[PDB]
Design an enzyme around this catalytic site. Structure first.
Site, short mmCIF file in Angstrom:
data_model
loop_
_atom_site.label_atom_id
_atom_site.label_comp_id
_atom_site.label_asym_id
_atom_site.label_seq_id
_atom_site.Cartn_x
_atom_site.Cartn_y
_atom_site.Cartn_z
N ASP A 1 40.47 38.72 -12.36
CA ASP A 1 41.39 37.79 -11.70
C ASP A 1 42.66 38.53 -11.31
O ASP A 1 43.41 38.99 -12.18
CB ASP A 1 41.76 36.65 -12.61
CG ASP A 1 42.60 35.62 -11.90
OD1 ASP A 1 43.81 35.53 -12.18
OD2 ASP A 1 42.03 34.92 -11.04
N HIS B 1 47.31 30.08 -4.18
CA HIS B 1 47.87 30.30 -5.52
C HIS B 1 48.61 29.07 -6.08
O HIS B 1 48.44 28.73 -7.24
CB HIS B 1 48.76 31.55 -5.52
CG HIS B 1 48.95 32.18 -6.87
ND1 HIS B 1 49.20 33.53 -7.03
CD2 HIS B 1 48.92 31.66 -8.11
CE1 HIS B 1 49.34 33.80 -8.32
NE2 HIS B 1 49.18 32.68 -9.00
N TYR C 1 51.32 39.68 -8.73
CA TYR C 1 51.33 40.36 -10.02
C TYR C 1 51.80 41.82 -9.89
O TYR C 1 52.03 42.49 -10.91
CB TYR C 1 49.95 40.30 -10.67
CG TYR C 1 49.43 38.89 -10.93
CD1 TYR C 1 50.27 37.77 -10.88
CD2 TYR C 1 48.08 38.70 -11.25
CE1 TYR C 1 49.77 36.49 -11.13
CE2 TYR C 1 47.57 37.43 -11.50
CZ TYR C 1 48.41 36.33 -11.45
OH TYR C 1 47.89 35.06 -11.70
N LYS D 1 44.63 35.87 -4.76
CA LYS D 1 45.29 34.61 -4.42
C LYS D 1 46.36 34.84 -3.38
O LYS D 1 47.05 35.87 -3.42
CB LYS D 1 45.91 33.97 -5.67
CG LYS D 1 45.05 34.10 -6.96
CD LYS D 1 45.66 33.31 -8.09
CE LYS D 1 44.90 33.49 -9.39
NZ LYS D 1 45.22 34.82 -10.00
N1 LIG Z 1 46.65 30.62 -11.00
C1 LIG Z 1 47.78 30.73 -11.70
O1 LIG Z 1 48.97 30.15 -11.28
C2 LIG Z 1 47.82 31.47 -12.99
C3 LIG Z 1 48.89 31.31 -13.86
C4 LIG Z 1 48.90 32.01 -15.07
C5 LIG Z 1 47.82 32.86 -15.35
N2 LIG Z 1 46.78 33.03 -14.47
C6 LIG Z 1 45.65 33.95 -14.79
O2 LIG Z 1 45.18 33.71 -16.11
C7 LIG Z 1 45.29 34.89 -16.88
C8 LIG Z 1 45.43 34.54 -18.36
O3 LIG Z 1 46.61 33.78 -18.59
P1 LIG Z 1 47.92 34.50 -19.20
O4 LIG Z 1 48.10 35.88 -18.71
O5 LIG Z 1 49.02 33.53 -18.93
O6 LIG Z 1 47.78 34.53 -20.80
P2 LIG Z 1 46.60 34.44 -21.92
O7 LIG Z 1 45.35 35.02 -21.45
O8 LIG Z 1 46.49 33.06 -22.45
O9 LIG Z 1 47.32 35.33 -23.06
C9 LIG Z 1 47.63 36.69 -22.85
C10 LIG Z 1 48.31 37.23 -24.11
O10 LIG Z 1 47.41 37.11 -25.21
C11 LIG Z 1 47.23 38.39 -25.80
N3 LIG Z 1 45.84 38.54 -26.25
C12 LIG Z 1 44.72 38.71 -25.47
N4 LIG Z 1 43.64 38.77 -26.30
C13 LIG Z 1 44.07 38.63 -27.58
C14 LIG Z 1 43.41 38.61 -28.81
N5 LIG Z 1 42.07 38.77 -28.85
N6 LIG Z 1 44.13 38.45 -29.98
C15 LIG Z 1 45.52 38.30 -29.94
N7 LIG Z 1 46.16 38.31 -28.71
C16 LIG Z 1 45.45 38.48 -27.56
C17 LIG Z 1 47.63 39.42 -24.75
O11 LIG Z 1 48.13 40.58 -25.40
P3 LIG Z 1 47.87 42.05 -24.82
O12 LIG Z 1 47.71 42.06 -23.34
O13 LIG Z 1 49.08 42.81 -25.32
O14 LIG Z 1 46.63 42.64 -25.48
C18 LIG Z 1 48.71 38.69 -23.98
O15 LIG Z 1 49.97 38.88 -24.62
C19 LIG Z 1 46.45 35.63 -16.22
O16 LIG Z 1 46.58 36.99 -16.56
C20 LIG Z 1 46.13 35.41 -14.75
O17 LIG Z 1 45.10 36.30 -14.40
C21 LIG Z 1 46.76 32.34 -13.31
O1 LIG Z 2 51.71 32.25 -10.56
C1 LIG Z 2 51.20 32.97 -11.46
O2 LIG Z 2 49.98 33.24 -11.50
C2 LIG Z 2 52.07 33.57 -12.55
C3 LIG Z 2 53.57 33.38 -12.35
C4 LIG Z 2 54.35 34.32 -11.67
CL1 LIG Z 2 53.59 35.76 -10.97
C5 LIG Z 2 55.74 34.17 -11.51
C6 LIG Z 2 56.35 33.04 -12.04
C7 LIG Z 2 55.58 32.09 -12.72
C8 LIG Z 2 54.20 32.27 -12.88
CL2 LIG Z 2 53.22 31.05 -13.76
#
Ligand SMILES: NC(=O)c1ccc[n+]([C@@H]2O[C@H](COP(=O)([O-])OP(=O)(O)OC[C@H]3O[C@@H](n4cnc5c(N)ncnc54)[C@H](OP(=O)(O)O)[C@@H]3O)[C@@H](O)[C@H]2O)c1
Ligand SMILES: O=C(O)Cc1c(Cl)cccc1Cl
EC number: 1.1.1.21
Length: 315
Positions: free
Chosen positions: A43, A110, A48, A77
């Site tokens: 993703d 997005h 980013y 996105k």
């Molecule tokens: N469409 C949107 O608006 C939107 C918004 C937010 C996110 N997203 C997507 O969703 C993805 C996931 O969401 P997110 O980045 O917000 O957070 P998340 O996946 O819920 O959490 C990430 C955090 O959890 C930690 N982590 C991962 N695996 C772990 C484990 N097995 N044990 C303990 N900690 C662990 C990571 O640490 P480390 O990296 O240090 O290992 C990082 O600090 C994003 O990266 C993005 O690709 C999309």
């Molecule tokens: O929109 C995203 O995926 C993540 C994101 C960014 Cl890049 C910047 C501000 C808020 C948030 Cl939630």
């Protein structure tokens, strides 16, 4: 299964690797490790600021023959500053250049909110608040449909759309391609039962983002709850001889959702993959659903007066 069927007939892997907050200096190794471990879905997003470095990893593994392009499912996105009809193709092509690919498997709007075009990702006026574009969701959807017809993307979808915004697209006169996917925040503290039910009834696949509660989000407070540390969730994990993270990733899978946990840590990337060898009981599932508190980690608070802000509606 390990993959879900989209409306374009393609199969999307149910587990993917997230890349928001993954530093450019670490994300190449992270993606390389993920691909070796067995991930086939990444993703991405222009916003980013790391697509180039993700692209480096993908290229290395394609060149090594670890995977063929057709086995990979790459998502990116369209950012809010590119909602204008005339900008959509350019934004997509920039992402394609950075990732070093000739097509995307899935390309998402997005956020439903359009911002003023320019160099700033969140353009601000003289006072408080983001400067909106006068574009609407339907004009942006029409531009996204062109990407499919041009062969740049295989499927198109949406992210952070409420059910009325989804409805708006589904009722669009002359609708050519239905949204394949709605990518939304989903975890035990924000279970999204209504929106998920709604989307699944319309044949739209739901991807759950922030499945671990995004502990590394830049606006985290020490008083804020932690899913990973919830003793109730620890107890379910302990019962299955799994980690709390593994339980939190398995949870959406059993609701027929795609899930995209982020990690740059090789041991956690590996741990997060080991979620196909156990099942949560119906009791476990019902209990996890009961923890809902409608706690939203990604609320886009700077856009609360935007005409297209998604989170005023109930779902
Ligand atoms: N469409 C949107 O608006 C939107 C918004 C937010 C996110 N997203 C997507 O969703 C993805 C996931 O969401 P997110 O980045 O917000 O957070 P998340 O996946 O819920 O959490 C990430 C955090 O959890 C930690 N982590 C991962 N695996 C772990 C484990 N097995 N044990 C303990 N900690 C662990 C990571 O640490 P480390 O990296 O240090 O290992 C990082 O600090 C994003 O990266 C993005 O690709 C999309
Ligand atoms: O929109 C995203 O995926 C993540 C994101 C960014 Cl890049 C910047 C501000 C808020 C948030 Cl939630």
């Amino acid at each position: 299964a390990s993959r879900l069927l989209l409306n374009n007939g393609a199969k999307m892997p149910i587990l993917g690797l997230g890349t928001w907050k993954s530093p450019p200096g670490q994300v190449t190794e992270a993606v390389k490790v993920a691909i070796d471990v067995g991930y086939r879905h990444i993703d991405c997003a222009h916003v980013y600021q790391n697509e180039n470095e993700v692209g480096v990893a993908i290229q290395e593994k394609l060149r090594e023959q670890v995977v063929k392009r057709e086995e990979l499912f790459i998502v990116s996105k369209l950012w809010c500053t590119y909602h204008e009809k005339g900008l959509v193709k350019g934004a997509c092509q920039k992402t394609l250049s950075d990732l070093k690919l000739d097509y995307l498997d899935l390309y998402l709007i997005h956020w439903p909110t359009g911002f003023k075009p320019g160099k700033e990702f969140f353009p601000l006026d003289e006072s408080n608040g983001v400067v909106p574009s006068d574009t609407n969701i339907l004009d942006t959807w029409a531009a996204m449909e062109e990407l499919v017809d041009e062969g740049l993307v295989k499927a198109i979808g949406i992210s952070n759309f409420n059910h009325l915004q989804v409805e708006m697209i589904l009722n669009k006169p002359g609708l050519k391609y239905k949204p394949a996917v709605n990518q939304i925040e989903c975890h035990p503290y924000l279970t999204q039962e209504k929106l998920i039910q709604y989307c699944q009834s319309k044949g739209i696949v739901v991807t759950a983002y922030s499945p671990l509660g995004s502990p590394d989000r830049p606006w985290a407070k020490p008083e804020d709850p932690s899913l990973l540390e919830d003793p109730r969730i620890k107890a379910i994990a302990a019962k299955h001889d799994k980690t709390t993270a593994q339980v939190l990733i398995r949870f959406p899978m059993q609701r027929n959702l795609v899930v995209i946990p982020k990690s740059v840590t090789p041991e956690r990337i590996a741990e997060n993959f080991k979620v196909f060898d156990f099942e949560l009981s119906s009791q476990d599932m019902t209990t996890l659903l009961s923890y809902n508190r409608n706690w939203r980690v990604c609320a886009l608070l700077s856009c609360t007066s935007h005409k297209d802000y998604p989170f005023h509606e109930e779902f």
